[PDB]
C-alpha cells in the first residue's frame, strides 16, 4: 500500500518554510530609491537580408559581431558596427529555432525541429564554414543551446530533458530530467557551474552541471515559460511566460521577489534580458514592441516600438552599449 | 572615406547579399504542403503513391510543378509550440482512415484533431485537402458491423454510399472559416490519381493567391 501523502506533506513544509522566511518585500525596500528617468532609446542600425521569420540571435563576446538564425535555412553573421555580412551559412534543415555563439568565437551552434544540434567551425584553413559536429540523441525539438567552452555544450529539448554534451566525442556527458513539460528556455550562470531551465509546466529548475541533479524548483507562473535570463551577480533570475507577466526569483531565499505586469499588457512574452548593471529588464512581447522595466521598482520606463510583427529574440552586449531585437518581419534592429 | 581592407569587406557583403537574393527566389517556386494525420491512417500510403527522427521532407514533381511535403507525425511534443512554423504553407493534407470508426473511438479523435487544425489562428486562409483511406476495407466492414453503433444519432441506410456521404459531411461542416478556405474531400483509390487531385487543388490555390497579391481580389 504505497502512499503519496508524504509528498504533499513535504510540499506543505517547503511552503511553510518559504513563508516563514519572508520578513519583508523587495518593493518595501526600494521605496526610497530614486526612480529611473524616462528611457529613450533610438534605432542606430537596421540589419536587412533575412527573407523569413528570424527565430533567435546571439551576441559575440567582443560585443561587435552577432549571429542570427532564420527559417529560410540561413545563419548570418553580422558585423554590427558597419552592418556587413561576415558569413552566410546555409542549413541542412530549414526548421531552425535557436542559435548560439562560442565564447572564444571559433564555433557557432544551431538546432530545431530535426532534434539535432549542429556545431559549425568558423576558423578553417579553407575559406568556408564546415559542419564540425552533429549531436543527436534528443527525441524532441531543440529549444535552446548554450556553450560552456569549445568542447562542452548544454542543450534543452522539447522532450522534457536537458543534456550536457562533449563535442569531441559527440556523446551526452550528462542528462537532466524532472520537467513534466517541454523545456523552452535555458540560461547559464556567469561562473558556468549552475544553470536554470524554464519549461512548459509553469516551472523553472536550478541544475548542477558537474554533479547532475536538480537543486531548487521555482513556481508561481500560471502558464508556459518561454524565456529566462540570469542576473549579473548570479543570485537571481527573471522569467517570462504567456500570461503577460515577468517574475524575479532569488536563489538564496528560494522565493519570488517581484512581478512585472501591467493591466493593458495581455500578450505573452518571448524574450527576457537584463542590462550590464542589472537595473533595467528588457522584455519582448507579441504586441510587436519591447518594454523596459525598472527591475527594482516594477515601473515601465520605456517602449521600443520599431518592429511590425512579434518580437522573437532579444539580446544585450557584454559591455551594455546596445540592445539587439529580432522580429518575425525579418529585420534585426540595434537600439542605443 | 573607407580603407583598402574596408572596401573589400563591403564587396564581400554585396556578393553575399546577391547570393542570398538569388537563393530566395529559387525556394519561392516550390509548393509547400503540410501532411497531417492521426497515425496509422494511411499517411504512408499517400506518401508512397505521390513519389514516382524529427521532420521528414519529401520532394517530387508533377507536370512541371515542384512539391515539398513535410511529414511531422514523428514529433512527440506539444503541437502548440511549433505549429506556427508552418504558417505560410500552401496547403494542408489531412489523412483519415475510414475503417477506424469501430476500433478503439479513434474516429472521434480524428474529428477533434481536424477541428483543432482547421480552426487555428494560423490557418485562417490555408486550404485543406482531406483524404479518406481504407475505402474497400470500409465497404467490407460496414456490411457486417452497422455504423449506427459508432453514431447513435445516425438516421439513414446501411449502404456504403450514404454512410460515406454522411462521414464526409460530418468532417466538412466542422470548419467555421467557410469564407477564406476550401476543403477538397477525396476518397483515395489504389491508383496516379491522388497526385492529380493535389495538383488541381494547388492550382486553384495558386490562382487565388496570384489574384490576391496582384490587387484584383
Amino acid at each position: 500500500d504505497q502512499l503519496r501523502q508524504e509528498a504533499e506533506q513535504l510540499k506543505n513544509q517547503i511552503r511553510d518554510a518559504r513563508k516563514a522566511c519572508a520578513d519583508a518585500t523587495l518593493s518595501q525596500i526600494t521605496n526610497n530609491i530614486d526612480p529611473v528617468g524616462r528611457i529613450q532609446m533610438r534605432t542606430r542600425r537596421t540589419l536587412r537580408g533575412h527573407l523569413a521569420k528570424i527565430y533567435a540571435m546571439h551576441w559575440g563576446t567582443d560585443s561587435r559581431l552577432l549571429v542570427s538564425a532564420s527559417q529560410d535555412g540561413k545563419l548570418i553573421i553580422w558585423d554590427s558596427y558597419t552592418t556587413n555580412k561576415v558569413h552566410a551559412i546555409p542549413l541542412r534543415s530549414s526548421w531552425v529555432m535557436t542559435c548560439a555563439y562560442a565564447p572564444s568565437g571559433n564555433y557557432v551552434a544551431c538546432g530545431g525541429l530535426d532534434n539535432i544540434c549542429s556545431i559549425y567551425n568558423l576558423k578553417t584553413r579553407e575559406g568556408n564554414v564546415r559542419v564540425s559536429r552533429e549531436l543527436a540523441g534528443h527525441t524532441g525539438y531543440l529549444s535552446c543551446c548554450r556553450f560552456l567552452d569549445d568542447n562542452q555544450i548544454v542543450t534543452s529539448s522539447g522532450d522534457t530533458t536537458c543534456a550536457l554534451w562533449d563535442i569531441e566525442t559527440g556523446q551526452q556527458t550528462t542528462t537532466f530530467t524532472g520537467h513534466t513539460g517541454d523545456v523552452m528556455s535555458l540560461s547559464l550562470a556567469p561562473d558556468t557551474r549552475l544553470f536554470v531551465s524554464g519549461a512548459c509546466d509553469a516551472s523553472a529548475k536550478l541544475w548542477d552541471v558537474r554533479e547532475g541533479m536538480c537543486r531548487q524548483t521555482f513556481t508561481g507562473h500560471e502558464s508556459d515559460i518561454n524565456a529566462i535570463c540570469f542576473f549579473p551577480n548570479g543570485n537571481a533570475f527573471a522569467t517570462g511566460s504567456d500570461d503577460a507577466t515577468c517574475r524575479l526569483f532569488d536563489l538564496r531565499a528560494d522565493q519570488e521577489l517581484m512581478t512585472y505586469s501591467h493591466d493593458n499588457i495581455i500578450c505573452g512574452i518571448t524574450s527576457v534580458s537584463f542590462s550590464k548593471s542589472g537595473r533595467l529588464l528588457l522584455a519582448g512581447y507579441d504586441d510587436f514592441n519591447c518594454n523596459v522595466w525598472d527591475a527594482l521598482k516594477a515601473d515601465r520606463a520605456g517602449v521600443l516600438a520599431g518592429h511590425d510583427n512579434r518580437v522573437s529574440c532579444l539580446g544585450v552586449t557584454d559591455d551594455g552599449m546596445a540592445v539587439a531585437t529580432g522580429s518575425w518581419d525579418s529585420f534585426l534592429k540595434i537600439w542605443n | 572615406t573607407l580603407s583598402a581592407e574596408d572596401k573589400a569587406a563591403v564587396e564581400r557583403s554585396k556578393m553575399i547579399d546577391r547570393n542570398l537574393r538569388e537563393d530566395g527566389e529559387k525556394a519561392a517556386r516550390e509548393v509547400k504542403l503540410l501532411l497531417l494525420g492521426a497515425g496509422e491512417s494511411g499517411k504512408n500510403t499517400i506518401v508512397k503513391q505521390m513519389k514516382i527522427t524529427g521532420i521528414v521532407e519529401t520532394h517530387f514533381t508533377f507536370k512541371d510543378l515542384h512539391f515539398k511535403m513535410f511529414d511531422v507525425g514523428a514529433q512527440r511534443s506539444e503541437r502548440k509550440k511549433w505549429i506556427h512554423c508552418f504558417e505560410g504553407v500552401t496547403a494542408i493534407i489531412f489523412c483519415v482512415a475510414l475503417s477506424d470508426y469501430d476500433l478503439v473511438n479513434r474516429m472521434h479523435a480524428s474529428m477533434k484533431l481536424f477541428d483543432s487544425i482547421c480552426n487555428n489562428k494560423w490557418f485562417t486562409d490555408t486550404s485543406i485537402i482531406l483524404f479518406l483511406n481504407k475505402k474497400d476495407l470500409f465497404e467490407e466492414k460496414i456490411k457486417k458491423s452497422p455504423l449506427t453503433i459508432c453514431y447513435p444519432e445516425y438516421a439513414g441506410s446501411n449502404t456504403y454510399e450514404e454512410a460515406a456521404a454522411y462521414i464526409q459531411c460530418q468532417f466538412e461542416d466542422l470548419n467555421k472559416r467557410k469564407d477564406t478556405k476550401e476543403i477538397y474531400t477525396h476518397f483515395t483509390c489504389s491508383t496516379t490519381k491522388n497526385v492529380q487531385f493535389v495538383f488541381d487543388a494547388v492550382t486553384d490555390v495558386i490562382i487565388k493567391n496570384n489574384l490576391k497579391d496582384c490587387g484584383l481580389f
Partner: single-chain antibody
Framework: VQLVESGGGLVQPGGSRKLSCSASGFAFSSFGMHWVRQAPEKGLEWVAYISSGSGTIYYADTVKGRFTISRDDPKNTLFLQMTSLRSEDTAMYYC??????????????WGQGTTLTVSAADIVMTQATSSVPVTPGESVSISCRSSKSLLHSNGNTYLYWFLQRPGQSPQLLIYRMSNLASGVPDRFSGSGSGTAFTLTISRLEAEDVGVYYCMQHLEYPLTFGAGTKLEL
C-alpha cells in the same frame, strides 16, 4: 591548401608570356589573389590584384597597360598575360591569396614561384638596417618606418611582416602590426606607433635565418620594405 604556378621560361624582349597559378585545397572563388614578383638579388614588389568575383582590379604603375590579370573560378586557375616584356621584368613571380572580412588574415599563403629571365604618391617603407649578424638564444629587433602614418580612423594600423627563408617562399608572421598569424610560434611579437614600427623575437632558433620584409596596406600601390637579413 597548395598553390603551384608554371609557365615561366626565357622570353625575348618585347614578347608575350602567360603565367598560370593552379589552386587546389581551399575555396578559390572566395579568395582575392595577388601577383608578387622578386627580382634576383633584390626585394619583392607588388604587381597586380584581382578581387573575388573579378570586381575590382589594380595594377602597379610600372606594370599598368603591359600586364593584364584574369581568374577562372570553375577550374581554380589564375592568369597573368604580359605584353611588351622589358629587361626589368626578370624575376620570380609569386601567387598569393588574401581574403578580406572582419578579423581575416590576408597574405597568409604564398606559392613556390616561376623563374622568368628576359634576355637583353607611394608610401616608401624604409628598413635602414639590412644585415644583422646575430646568434641563437638572444633577442633581435627589426625596425621599420613609413612616410605616411598607417593608423586609420577605424583603429587598425595596416602593417604586415613576412619571413623569407633561404631558398623558400615568404610566409606571414604578423598582420596589422599586432595579431600573430596562425601556425607562427609565440616567440614573435610586434608593436609600434602610427609611424614607427618594430618586430621583436624573444627566443631565436636555427630556423629564423632569413630576410624580414615590411608591407603597407592602407593604400592600393602596396609597397614592401628593403628587407633585413638575419645571418647566423
Amino acid at each position: 591548401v597548395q598553390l603551384v604556378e608554371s609557365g615561366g621560361g626565357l622570353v625575348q624582349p618585347g614578347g608575350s608570356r602567360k603565367l598560370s597559378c593552379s589552386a587546389s585545397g581551399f575555396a578559390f572563388s572566395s579568395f582575392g589573389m595577388h601577383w608578387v614578383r622578386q627580382a634576383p638579388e633584390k626585394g619583392l614588389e607588388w604587381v597586380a590584384y584581382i578581387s573575388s568575383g573579378s570586381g575590382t582590379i589594380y595594377y602597379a604603375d610600372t606594370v599598368k597597360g603591359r600586364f593584364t590579370i584574369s581568374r577562372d573560378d570553375p577550374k581554380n586557375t589564375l592568369f597573368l598575360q604580359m605584353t611588351s616584356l622589358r629587361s626589368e621584368d626578370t624575376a620570380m613571380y609569386y601567387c598569393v591569396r588574401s581574403i578580406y572580412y572582419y578579423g581575416s588574415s590576408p597574405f597568409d599563403f604564398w606559392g613556390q614561384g616561376t623563374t622568368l629571365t628576359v634576355s637583353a604618391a607611394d608610401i616608401v617603407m624604409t628598413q635602414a638596417t639590412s644585415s644583422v649578424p646575430v646568434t641563437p638564444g638572444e633577442s633581435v629587433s627589426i625596425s621599420c618606418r613609413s612616410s605616411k602614418s598607417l593608423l586609420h580612423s577605424n583603429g587598425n594600423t595596416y602593417l604586415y611582416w613576412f619571413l623569407q627563408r633561404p631558398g623558400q617562399s615568404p610566409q606571414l608572421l604578423i598582420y596589422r602590426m599586432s595579431n600573430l598569424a596562425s601556425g607562427v610560434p609565440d616567440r614573435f611579437s610586434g608593436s609600434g606607433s602610427g609611424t614607427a614600427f618594430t618586430l621583436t623575437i624573444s627566443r631565436l632558433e636555427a630556423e629564423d635565418v632569413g630576410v624580414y620584409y615590411c608591407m603597407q596596406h592602407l593604400e592600393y600601390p602596396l609597397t614592401f620594405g628593403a628587407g633585413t637579413k638575419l645571418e647566423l
